[PDB]
């Protein structure tokens, strides 16, 4: 195999490839989510920007994983990227709820990969996950949580107005 | 006693120690109030910041009192700090009402300490209180009063929306 | 419970709350230690500054833990803060010895919390502890160790002079 | 009397004149104290500078009182300035002890003048004393207290060495 490869199991290599596919699919979902809010009949610029920034970040997460795969002497294998689960994404509350379950899925896959790295006794992979993925997932899910609380507060009172103000004052002005 | 101590009664020294405990407990309450509004299910960043800035200011008020105690030749004695009276703080209106009674308590303790300094004929303590505590308490209670009026105005109309706008436009934008 | 909470056990949440209480009590002890050395009859400015900087750092350690608690979807619960174990702290050697046992206690609590995070298989908490608490504790206990060696060296020869020089040349000039 | 004079009693005017004489005598004592430590057989430059800075400050205290006397429509009356109580001032410990009793005397005279201003119901004089004399006296006596503690610490161990180090490291280097 690789002249470079040391202490890097085939189970972790396969799992890193599965996680690349997940981040790339997560990126594809956020592209869809971003352009839906750019529709003239949805028209919530701040929400479009929030999801297109996440699409970039998830694409960057996969590339980092691909760099790490090569560094360890693993081989990247790509699979088909499943289209997003929805074509239309409803309201900001609906899209934020879909985004938080999407993020909990990715965070579960990270946790599982870490367990595996621990079971395989691979400290570098564990180091890699802690440093680049674990805390960012925790901060992003807390951000999305905060946003779901605010959207519910607003949309509980007056829906159309609530959505506009949130986009205007939290996403276009924070 | 102290080679330094002059015209500094044991009644004032004991009262200054009681007031340090009160400011430190006030700081502890504001820490609690600040982190509650940082909860993903409360999520009102501006309100969290408003209370964490007050926690710092009250901690600073106690340290000033501790410096003055040493300057006068009094001895600092610390007591247990009682945990905050509540774990959950409700709404911004509820937390602002709790904060204003907390502040009126501290201002009453300052007034009482001043009476005592006057009764003990201690002009420097009276000078110290006037210069660093009395006007700041009056300005802060007037600020909190203004905020309670605005929150009631907003929450009288549409509660969830009202709270968001207040945090957005008075505390995150003033 | 929290919409945010994932892989965050109640055992760790409870232990994080216990550790916040410990850092806040550690901060309260260092406040006491700092103001004692500010007494006109102790008068060791450098030692006062050394302990008041630690009081701030421990307060900051607790706030970080409180931020992490919210990020993970845990709930902060505050307890009474026990007053410092002493009112008077003796000599710099006595206060530095008290400070190092205080710090070993906190470092043991960190170690125990990490064991727990490992037993609960919580990589993010372990990541959090390693990055912000573990190395700082090790560097601070080594600093305190170095200072105890120097104070003993000085106070072994000529006590009053030794203490002054240490404050003058290590703490006011290093 | 003065076309300007309002609510300014003859008791306060006389007491302000007595306090000018005291500050001017305090300044004269500190001049003596400063030049003694400039003697080739005493030769403690830092101590000389410490007392000559106090001589200037006390001279400035009297001039402020003289300005306030004119502002209130009182008339300044000067008396003979008694020479300092000693010609030689011993050691730094001896000179610092003499300086602290000198300062407690002046602070007692300030306190007495304030009582009088309160008894005469003269708020401006009380304001004047609080703002310019009372806190500075309290900070200076605490500084002198701290210095007496350090000198005793040093001179308790090894006298000649102790004095040199104090002048070198607290007064020439703090």
Short mmCIF file of N, CA, C and O in Angstrom, two decimals, chain A residues 142 145-150 153-154 156-158 161-162 165-171 173-174, chain B residues 37-45 91 158-165 167-169 172-173:
data_model
loop_
_atom_site.label_atom_id
_atom_site.label_comp_id
_atom_site.label_asym_id
_atom_site.label_seq_id
_atom_site.Cartn_x
_atom_site.Cartn_y
_atom_site.Cartn_z
N UNK A 142 -25.36 25.46 18.22
CA UNK A 142 -25.89 26.38 19.21
C UNK A 142 -26.43 27.62 18.48
O UNK A 142 -27.45 28.19 18.88
N UNK A 145 -29.74 26.80 17.03
CA UNK A 145 -30.69 26.75 18.12
C UNK A 145 -31.17 28.13 18.53
O UNK A 145 -32.39 28.39 18.59
N UNK A 146 -30.20 29.04 18.66
CA UNK A 146 -30.60 30.39 19.03
C UNK A 146 -31.55 30.98 17.99
O UNK A 146 -32.48 31.73 18.26
N UNK A 147 -31.18 30.89 16.71
CA UNK A 147 -32.06 31.32 15.63
C UNK A 147 -33.43 30.65 15.65
O UNK A 147 -34.37 31.44 15.49
N UNK A 148 -33.58 29.33 15.88
CA UNK A 148 -34.91 28.74 15.99
C UNK A 148 -35.69 29.34 17.12
O UNK A 148 -36.89 29.61 16.94
N UNK A 149 -35.07 29.64 18.27
CA UNK A 149 -35.82 30.27 19.32
C UNK A 149 -36.34 31.62 18.89
O UNK A 149 -37.53 31.83 19.13
N UNK A 150 -35.51 32.44 18.25
CA UNK A 150 -35.95 33.76 17.80
C UNK A 150 -37.00 33.74 16.72
O UNK A 150 -37.94 34.53 16.77
N UNK A 153 -40.38 32.85 18.38
CA UNK A 153 -40.84 34.03 19.09
C UNK A 153 -41.55 35.02 18.20
O UNK A 153 -42.64 35.44 18.57
N UNK A 154 -41.00 35.22 17.01
CA UNK A 154 -41.49 36.17 16.05
C UNK A 154 -42.65 35.69 15.24
O UNK A 154 -43.66 36.37 15.05
N UNK A 156 -44.50 33.32 16.28
CA UNK A 156 -45.62 33.03 17.17
C UNK A 156 -46.57 34.22 17.22
O UNK A 156 -47.77 34.07 17.40
N UNK A 157 -46.00 35.43 17.19
CA UNK A 157 -46.77 36.65 17.20
C UNK A 157 -47.43 36.99 15.84
O UNK A 157 -48.65 36.89 15.69
N UNK A 158 -46.67 37.37 14.82
CA UNK A 158 -47.20 37.75 13.50
C UNK A 158 -46.24 37.25 12.41
O UNK A 158 -45.20 37.83 12.12
N UNK A 161 -44.65 39.34 9.17
CA UNK A 161 -43.84 40.40 9.75
C UNK A 161 -42.61 39.82 10.46
O UNK A 161 -41.48 40.29 10.29
N UNK A 162 -42.83 38.71 11.18
CA UNK A 162 -41.83 38.06 12.01
C UNK A 162 -40.63 37.59 11.23
O UNK A 162 -39.47 37.88 11.52
N UNK A 165 -38.60 40.69 9.83
CA UNK A 165 -37.77 41.31 10.88
C UNK A 165 -36.55 40.47 11.24
O UNK A 165 -35.42 40.97 11.39
N UNK A 166 -36.74 39.14 11.28
CA UNK A 166 -35.65 38.24 11.62
C UNK A 166 -34.59 38.36 10.55
O UNK A 166 -33.39 38.49 10.82
N UNK A 167 -35.00 38.30 9.28
CA UNK A 167 -34.03 38.41 8.18
C UNK A 167 -33.36 39.76 8.18
O UNK A 167 -32.13 39.80 8.03
N UNK A 168 -34.15 40.80 8.46
CA UNK A 168 -33.67 42.15 8.48
C UNK A 168 -32.76 42.36 9.65
O UNK A 168 -31.67 42.87 9.43
N UNK A 169 -33.14 41.98 10.88
CA UNK A 169 -32.41 42.41 12.06
C UNK A 169 -31.48 41.37 12.66
O UNK A 169 -30.58 41.68 13.45
N UNK A 170 -31.63 40.08 12.39
CA UNK A 170 -30.65 39.12 12.89
C UNK A 170 -29.75 38.71 11.76
O UNK A 170 -28.55 38.68 11.94
N UNK A 171 -30.29 38.33 10.61
CA UNK A 171 -29.41 37.85 9.54
C UNK A 171 -28.88 38.99 8.67
O UNK A 171 -27.71 38.85 8.29
N UNK A 173 -28.47 42.06 9.84
CA UNK A 173 -27.87 43.04 10.74
C UNK A 173 -27.23 42.49 12.01
O UNK A 173 -27.18 43.16 13.04
N UNK A 174 -26.69 41.26 11.91
CA UNK A 174 -25.97 40.58 12.99
C UNK A 174 -25.26 39.37 12.41
O UNK A 174 -25.96 38.68 11.49
N UNK B 37 -29.92 34.09 29.54
CA UNK B 37 -30.32 34.67 28.27
C UNK B 37 -29.40 34.23 27.14
O UNK B 37 -29.63 34.54 25.96
N UNK B 38 -28.37 33.49 27.48
CA UNK B 38 -27.52 32.86 26.52
C UNK B 38 -27.97 31.43 26.21
O UNK B 38 -27.37 30.83 25.30
N UNK B 39 -28.96 30.87 26.93
CA UNK B 39 -29.55 29.57 26.64
C UNK B 39 -30.14 29.47 25.25
O UNK B 39 -30.78 30.45 24.87
N UNK B 40 -30.01 28.38 24.49
CA UNK B 40 -30.49 28.27 23.14
C UNK B 40 -32.00 28.41 23.16
O UNK B 40 -32.57 28.82 22.17
N UNK B 41 -32.68 28.08 24.25
CA UNK B 41 -34.10 28.29 24.29
C UNK B 41 -34.57 29.66 24.82
O UNK B 41 -35.75 29.94 25.06
N UNK B 42 -33.63 30.55 25.10
CA UNK B 42 -33.99 31.90 25.46
C UNK B 42 -33.39 32.78 24.39
O UNK B 42 -34.14 33.56 23.78
N UNK B 43 -32.08 32.67 24.22
CA UNK B 43 -31.41 33.24 23.07
C UNK B 43 -31.63 34.74 22.80
O UNK B 43 -31.81 35.22 21.66
N UNK B 44 -31.29 35.58 23.79
CA UNK B 44 -31.43 37.02 23.63
C UNK B 44 -30.10 37.61 24.02
O UNK B 44 -29.77 38.03 25.12
N UNK B 45 -29.27 37.59 23.02
CA UNK B 45 -27.92 38.04 23.13
C UNK B 45 -27.77 39.41 23.76
O UNK B 45 -26.95 39.57 24.66
N UNK B 91 -38.86 36.08 31.39
CA UNK B 91 -38.80 37.01 30.28
C UNK B 91 -37.89 38.20 30.54
O UNK B 91 -37.51 38.44 31.68
N UNK B 158 -47.48 43.05 21.35
CA UNK B 158 -47.26 41.68 20.85
C UNK B 158 -45.97 41.12 21.48
O UNK B 158 -44.85 41.42 21.07
N UNK B 159 -46.15 40.25 22.48
CA UNK B 159 -45.11 39.78 23.36
C UNK B 159 -43.82 39.25 22.74
O UNK B 159 -42.77 39.83 23.00
N UNK B 160 -43.87 38.18 21.93
CA UNK B 160 -42.68 37.59 21.33
C UNK B 160 -41.98 38.58 20.44
O UNK B 160 -40.77 38.73 20.56
N UNK B 161 -42.75 39.26 19.60
CA UNK B 161 -42.18 40.25 18.71
C UNK B 161 -41.53 41.39 19.51
O UNK B 161 -40.41 41.82 19.23
N UNK B 162 -42.23 41.81 20.59
CA UNK B 162 -41.85 42.94 21.42
C UNK B 162 -40.50 42.77 22.06
O UNK B 162 -39.59 43.60 21.99
N UNK B 163 -40.31 41.58 22.61
CA UNK B 163 -39.06 41.20 23.23
C UNK B 163 -37.88 41.19 22.26
O UNK B 163 -36.79 41.58 22.71
N UNK B 164 -38.11 40.65 21.05
CA UNK B 164 -37.08 40.56 20.03
C UNK B 164 -36.66 41.97 19.63
O UNK B 164 -35.45 42.24 19.65
N UNK B 165 -37.64 42.83 19.32
CA UNK B 165 -37.35 44.20 18.88
C UNK B 165 -36.58 45.00 19.92
O UNK B 165 -35.60 45.71 19.63
N UNK B 167 -34.58 43.78 22.27
CA UNK B 167 -33.20 43.29 22.30
C UNK B 167 -32.44 43.75 21.07
O UNK B 167 -31.30 44.19 21.25
N UNK B 168 -33.11 43.73 19.93
CA UNK B 168 -32.53 44.11 18.68
C UNK B 168 -32.27 45.59 18.66
O UNK B 168 -31.15 45.96 18.34
N UNK B 169 -33.24 46.44 19.00
CA UNK B 169 -33.12 47.87 18.74
C UNK B 169 -32.74 48.73 19.94
O UNK B 169 -32.30 49.87 19.81
N UNK B 172 -29.20 45.67 21.43
CA UNK B 172 -28.15 45.41 20.45
C UNK B 172 -27.91 46.65 19.60
O UNK B 172 -26.99 46.65 18.76
N UNK B 173 -28.69 47.74 19.70
CA UNK B 173 -28.47 48.91 18.85
C UNK B 173 -28.60 50.27 19.54
O UNK B 173 -28.96 51.27 18.92
#
